């Protein structure tokens with residue numbers, strides 16, 4: 001559960017991400033697939049070669065969902081219903097994988113906003129991602 | 142995140158627990174300390190002997206907080222704020238411990254309510270316990 | 283691993299466990315309680331509801347196999363790493379089962395025993411038993427460790 | 428673990444790592460990001476706030492010790508179980524550190540390298556680095572598995 005402070009930190013970090021959300025979204029997938037090769041099993045139909053237009057397009061999808069979540073920090077389950085549906089019910093993604101993408105996403109933000117990625121912001125972003133992960137892996141509908 | 146079926150299952154199972162809450166609460170602690178001895182390091186000032194009146198009394202307190210949570214399934218953070226403060230801020234209990242206790246409680250319940258401890262009830266309680274665990278390890282202050 | 287006692291106790295208790303029955307309930311509860319695990323059992327057919335899961339013939343049959351390996355494992359508590367070597371390869375290398383899952387199953391198995399034996403499944407026995415399932419989870423996770 | 432390819436990569440990059448600084452930043456972020464870890468360093472003084480934690484001299488000092496252990500591991504990449512036997516013993520047997528925590532620190536380590544190297548710490552380089560930390564975490568958790 002996020003503090004009021006977490007919510008502000010998440011919003012601040014995200015404002016810095018701004019128009020690069022998609023790019024960061026794409027790099028993160030990219031880092032996950034490379035560091036954690038078992039995640040690839042979920043994308044048998046994807047071109048997973050380095051630089052894939054497919055991974056890029058998918059990164060934008062992911063980034064787009066995260067911005068949606070940032071905007072609805074007070075009702076994530078409400079905000080990401082369609083997504084749990086897909087991830088929990090449809091794809092049955094093992095929860096461990098969500099920890100791989102989160103890590104990948106922090107690695108990505110850290111490298112691009114070294115100034116902004118303070119320990120406090122790092123702490124709040126981690127919590128937020130744990131929160132989204134929980135919503136996406138829960139069958140509450 | 143709990144579904145409406147989840148909440149129904151929790152209320153009903155906890156309803157069957159009824160007046161034996163304290164006893165079950167005490168047995169869960171005893172099973173925890175015995176199976177996972179590292180847990181004991183959080184209670185150095187306790188007599189963790191067999192049947193300690195301290196354990197039994199602690200068991201009672203744990204059971205009363207769960208009842209309170211069952212009564213507030215829609216606002217755990219609000220309902221358990223004081224306990225979060227204790228466990229998260231003051232005690233700094235490693236979250237793996239919550240898993241050990243949750244397991245310990247489920248083992249207790251299955252053994253005492255075998256006809257009621259259905260695969261569905263089991264699933265719902267496991268989720269309920271993870272939600273409580275999240276609250277208790279979160280510093281939302 | 284267990285000492286002489288833990289072992290004997292664990293052993294003696296086991297002699298009363300109907301593998302057939304208990305294995306089907308253990309696997310079934312896994313798919314119900316931790317539903318992402320259904321992904322690995324796609325070929326099993328209908329896992330749509332808890333009833334479907336618990337009543338699925340593939341689930342039940344596969345559950346019995348799992349418990350057989352456990353029973354074998356119980357005969358070789360001395361060498362769990364050796365005894366589970368092939369399964370370690372299958373689960374790790376071919377299936378790619380996150381090792382976290384091995385723990386969930388072992389835990390679900392203990393819940394199942396508690397259910398089936400009530401008070402007979404004492405806190406003390408439970409404990410020796412936690413040792414066992416942790417040992418088995420570690421043997422299977424070897425191609426990770 | 429690493430191939431010779433990867434051995435080389437990991438080794439070259441490391442050559443550029445400022446152990447002092449990275450170490451202190453890694454330990455500090457751990458304590459701030461995963462607050463319960465603070466329970467093991469109660470003796471370090473004030474860990475009240477991020478600022479306090481990051482600026483704690485004992486934290487800074489200890490971060491160096493750790494990274495030092497890291498540097499050594501880097502040298503004995505093919506026998507991490509042995510190189511860390513001693514630490515495994517301390518952390519597992521004496522400290523009772525839950526091994527999940529070993530994964531958190533490594534992960535924090537990777538985030539810090541990324542913060543400090545930017546584009547220099549590529550997806551491909553990170554990938555190699557992840558194997559190392561996984562190795563170190565498994566070697567430390569040895570006393571368990």
Ligand code: HEM
Nearest residue numbers: 039042043061062065066087091093097098101132133136
């Ligand atoms: C931060 C957590 C995540 C978020 C926000 C997220 C978001 C999304 C979005 C927005 C989509 C596309 C939905 C559409 O078609 O419009 C999607 C699809 C997908 N995601 Fe995720 N995802 C997350 C984690 C994961 C993880 C950890 C995995 C597995 C490694 C995963 C596997 C997939 C797959 C297999 C698809 C379907 C791809 C396709 O066929 O288009 N997701 N996700």
Ligand code: HEM
Nearest residue numbers: 180183184202203206207224232234238239242273274277
């Ligand atoms: C569902 C999970 C848990 C619940 C509901 C719970 C509940 C409680 C309650 C009601 C109290 C006493 C509050 C009062 O003073 O009125 C307490 C105290 C305490 N709890 Fe927990 N607890 C949980 C998990 C844990 C875990 C996993 C640990 C560590 C293994 C732990 C360690 C402690 C300690 C050390 C105290 C203080 C004991 C004393 O000095 O009296 N708790 N808990």
Ligand code: HEM
Nearest residue numbers: 319322323347348351352369377379383384387388418422
């Ligand atoms: C205590 C831990 C476990 C034990 C002892 C165990 C045992 C077994 C055995 C004996 C087999 C069949 C071997 C054969 O084909 O000869 C098997 C297969 C399999 N296991 Fe496990 N298992 C365990 C945990 C898991 C977990 C946690 C999962 C995934 C959630 C899993 C997924 C599978 C799958 C997908 C198969 C093959 C299905 C098929 O081809 O019919 N296992 N396991």
Ligand code: HEM
Nearest residue numbers: 464467468492493496497514522524528529532533563567
């Ligand atoms: C990458 C994983 C880790 C490595 C390589 C590592 C390394 C070290 C080293 C080199 C020492 C000093 C031993 C000596 O006194 O010579 C140490 C001590 C210690 N470690 Fe870590 N550590 C790791 C993870 C952790 C984690 C995650 C925790 C707990 C949150 C932890 C808790 C401690 C504590 C409490 C001490 C002793 C403090 C003292 O006695 O002054 N370690 N570790």
